Assembly symmetry: D2
Homo-oligomer: 374 residues x 4
């Protein structure tokens, strides 16, 4: 006989909730990629009860036991009782981490992941205490898009995305740190790759999950303001700009809302338009002020370069102008290594090896920057 324990009935000491949470606690909505739970349990068997819904973009999850990747799978709409381990030695504790592989989906109001409770024959023990906290904000790189799948695959579908093979989770793991991911493929600091001015991360940063819209998501608490005071990160890693630079080489965008045409322009010369560059610069300044406002003590580190480094000067202009004007001494720039021909995954995006290389250089930087040498 397995006991059933509702997720909200577990002592805060005996569960780590990974990722941003709002007001709803039973069942637990897991809004973000990398989001989920970690428990440490004895016993022979563990199952998690969950509910999922979706249409075009189905849910994916991944499981790690004692820090090691074990499983990865799709979940189709409905109730599931998912077996996390079985036939194990009863007396020894196992650390179990199950998390969402798929990013929040801005244009998809149906997709959701809800954790209800656990079935178990053993007992819950105290979970590791993560004093170190890292927030990651980004585009599809931070969504781990291309981290699975063959070189030539191009379909924009969930199976190619992950938190399981991802520089951010690799960095958090190496540094023994709790982590939040906030990301959206194709989105920029100012506009999306396709010149879509609505597709910027800043506009969506402040709600519990601003990227989860519609009635159903509203019932889950996603559109309420996020309680920043409850989770203050030591550092905020900002990996944005790739899509902003891409937009300069992309056709003009007609906006369905405010019926105007937007285009980040390139000079006849081949260089970027300056006032257009300045729109990014200002967007950067505004975003940095937003971040400082909600995280008064965090080290903000703009970390950019896994898919080219052409926005180097524009990014650092934004930071420098913000810094001098605000007297902010805890804002840095760190360039990530570029993905070489050999290390691409699918969608011509960074694969596992590029993520690993990026995590290695980011971890080294954070050790020195934060004094996290141990």
């Amino acid at each position: 006989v397995l006991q059933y324990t509702e997720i909200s009935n577990i002592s805060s000491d005996k569960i780590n909730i990974l990722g941003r949470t709002g007001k709803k606690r039973q069942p637990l909505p897991v809004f973000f990629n990398g989001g989920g739970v970690e428990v440490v349990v004895t016993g022979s068997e563990l199952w998690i009860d969950l509910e999922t819904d979706s249409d075009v973009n189905e849910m994916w999850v991944a499981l790690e036991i004692n820090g090691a990747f074990i499983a990865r799978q799709m979940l189709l709409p409905g109730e599931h009782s998912l077996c996390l381990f079985r036939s194990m030695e009863k007396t020894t504790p196992k650390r179990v981490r199950l998390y969402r592989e798929l990013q929040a989906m801005n244009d998809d109001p149906k997709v959701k992941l809800l954790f209800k409770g656990f079935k178990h024959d053993g007992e819950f023990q105290n979970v590791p205490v993560y004093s170190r906290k890292l927030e990651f904000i980004g585009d599809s790189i931070t969504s781990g898009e291309g981290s699975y799948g063959a070189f030539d695959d191009v379909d924009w579908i969930p199976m190619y995305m992950s938190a399981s093979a991802n520089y951010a989770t690799m960095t958090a793991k190496a540094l023994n740190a709790d982590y939040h991911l906030v990301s959206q493929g194709g989105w920029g600091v100012f506009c999306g790759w396709d010149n879509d001015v609505r597709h910027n991360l800043p506009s969506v940063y402040e709600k519990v999950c601003g990227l989860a819209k519609g009635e159903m998501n509203e019932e889950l608490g996603a559109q309420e303001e996020y309680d920043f005071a409850s989770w203050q990160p030591d550092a905020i890693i900002v990996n944005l700009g790739t899509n902003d630079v891409t937009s300069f080489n992309q056709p003009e965008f007609l906006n369905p809302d405010d019926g105007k045409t937007y285009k980040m322009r390139t000079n006849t010369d081949g260089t970027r338009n300056r006032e257009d560059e300045l729109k990014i610069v200002s967007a950067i300044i505004d975003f940095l002020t937003m971040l400082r406002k909600h995280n008064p003590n965090a080290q903000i580190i703009w970390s950019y370069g896994m898919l080219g480094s052409d926005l180097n000067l524009v990014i650092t202009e934004g930071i420098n102008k913000y810094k001098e004007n605000a007297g902010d001494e805890k804002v840095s720039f760190f360039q990530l290594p570029n993905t070489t021909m050999e290390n691409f995954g699918s969608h011509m995006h960074p694969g596992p090896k590029s993520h690993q290389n990026a995590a290695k250089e980011l971890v080294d930087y954070l050790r020195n920057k934060l004094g996290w040498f141990e």
Copy 2:
């Protein structure tokens, strides 16, 4: 809507069946680790209908689309409808490979995996043709035991075993080769690590799946003689001996079947008992004979060393004596690189990196030996 096509109703040029098959075609019994199917299909959606049974040791499978690892999961007893992909661009063909992660289980008559058919909106295309064929015979290394899981995990359960992170499948993939895996954790060429003389790979080699025993498996055709003529490998990789050397440092074993006790002995000198070494030599001679008989043209390559190389001399003594007596010029010894501290997986067994290292050296050996440049 979704068409249903039974696995046996896909014409040969539009399916690759991976692994030893017997007389049963519908549904398809998936006997061995690394066994399964590969198809290439258009359409937006593909499902596979399958049945599984198990008790203590539940079934695991892994999915690869266009050669890339996508998913890996447990399957509990019953009929399942597994979605292999969905929401895809309809016109592009996708190569889909779905295989078993769990070895055949000698002492577990209930465990099984059956493939019934596909649900699909697209059409089956010609699959790639693998004229190059490789058979791998081994112990838990070849079962990929330890290829998943943390350093200190020790439970002997399915989640830790794989074909997905495995030197054998990495080797086959690199060389663009069809492969068969025949393996059993803890088993030797002569005896198991615990001195169990019944636990030797030669004794199960000749059947479709000799490691699939009991009534249900018999009905699946596992206990009939394997038709070797239908699938002849270019090379046979034999990775045995690790468990034979281990037995020398392990307590005696009481055989439940004859009441006799068995113990591979070491002298109060620290050295292996010479008479016992010779039982391994004889098992090797006998197994090479068996292998030649069923595979008259294959290059036999004893590949050993991922968990120590202590048996190098006994193995080559076996090979050398067999070869001289048989006049066999197509038998070799290749040493695999040892697993070092930075490269252990779980169970103190080879991890992904060790498998990778071993595959690189083996691939290079096979290119040169077989002219596979």
Copy 3:
């Protein structure tokens, strides 16, 4: 027997002179690290006749045959006849490159290396034509200080310096490019590591070899203005800043020239003084102007990071302010990877593996920037 040919008598197409040269042609003065000659010769034997002088800091050279490192040795004062190869097959050509390992020595008027001629039994053939040209401006990293020697060796001596194991020559080689190295251990863009304001690279850039001073050096043509027009690089790699950062944590410097004390200062909270930061910013602006002036078409790439990246924002402020004012769309910033624990050489400076890692990242960057995919 062995013919003798003065370096001056070898036709321009039969010799590649590496490094800046002035008016003196016979004998040929080799002013800079990485400086020297490349020839392609048949015959069984080749010797070079040379002259060297020194006292505290003896000369070192290294030999490459067909692009492969062969030899490295010190040369003490006097005339030398150095055997480059012997007992070889007579009919086969070999490419021979002999170059200086030691940087120009600013405060050492005696140290010199002069190439006089070759003793040879075979014939000189046409040497490769390098249309690609790269200038590298740097501190001890670009001097390869630490590229030889054990982890704990600390003596500030020539044997530890090289162009033979050096990210710059590695980059040049990978790219099939002619190269000039101009560097001084301990120097910055504004001041030296010890707060010494006369120890900046801009101040020595414009002469043939501003770092070769005194009478005998003046006779060698070193203090004459360099003819920039005669050697125009496709890209200029600037690796400076490490010593400017260090000066902030270093005791004040008394300048023996003008008797003033100089000190880059740190605020109570540990951050750098803004005004002192601005002095580095200005020096950067001024140097970029100097570079653009003498090199109207070169891509200037500030490449910094092998020993810490804390000057990222200051460097990027300098570049951005310079750029916004001039027309210049041909200045970039590129961050080099940091030297980790297991990749230090001697003097706690980057070792062979660190140079190698840096060269790999820089090469990838240069390919994509300059269109040198082959």
Copy 4:
């Protein structure tokens, strides 16, 4: 002021002599590749006085200070005074290792290296004590032939050979071990690559340096019986067989010393002549006996495979028959990794990387076999 000290006048506790010695101690003959001396000295400078002779094949040496490669150079006939270091901090002890890069030359009676003494302003300190000892017996792989030079270079001359980049010295260094190298390029256990039955390592093993022949070498004591009792290795690594395999595909050899023609035969179906295979087996048994006789306690390890493993079965047949008849439980076979496409040096032989890979695998084997985890 420079004191002069003869090599034979340094206390045994203040010098490590590397390589086989005979009864000639002053001056010290350096017979073998990897042979030479190690001292540790204070002071600002150190010179070594040495004599060398040669004709076609000139002497090469390499210098390591505190375990780090510093220098490599040719030495032409005559007396030399080599400066090993200078201008150093007087009080710090420096460990200095100077060794021969060139193998003993069987058919070159003129080539020689002698160490006479040191000029030094500091004092000799105690040297490290290497209680662990390793003997390496091999062919050109063990002579490090190909370890320097470009991929397509083919001339059989000294500059391409080394102990400085060599699996044997890499192994010894890793295990903190004294080492002796005994090697001859082209030579086998039974015959040379060209079917020359005189070119076998067993025949020269027992003398101080059996490969140093002729009157001059006789006066150096090379042709006297080696005193094995004075230096007993923990392990003997035998890397032979590559040339024995090769001979099967090479034209017959006309032996000068008798009138006879020798040829290892290949059957008209492509396989090796069994009777000729058995000649190698007998040579192996015979050599193993010889090794056991002079080394009663050593672990003998046949380590083969850096240039193919085709003789795997014949070698282990030799070992197996030897061990059975002798009851010898301290003889092993370890197959070394094959040199792959990316890892060749010059002459289609193993380059630095292949040596390194071989050393790492061999080091791991010896740690386990000899219990050298410390």
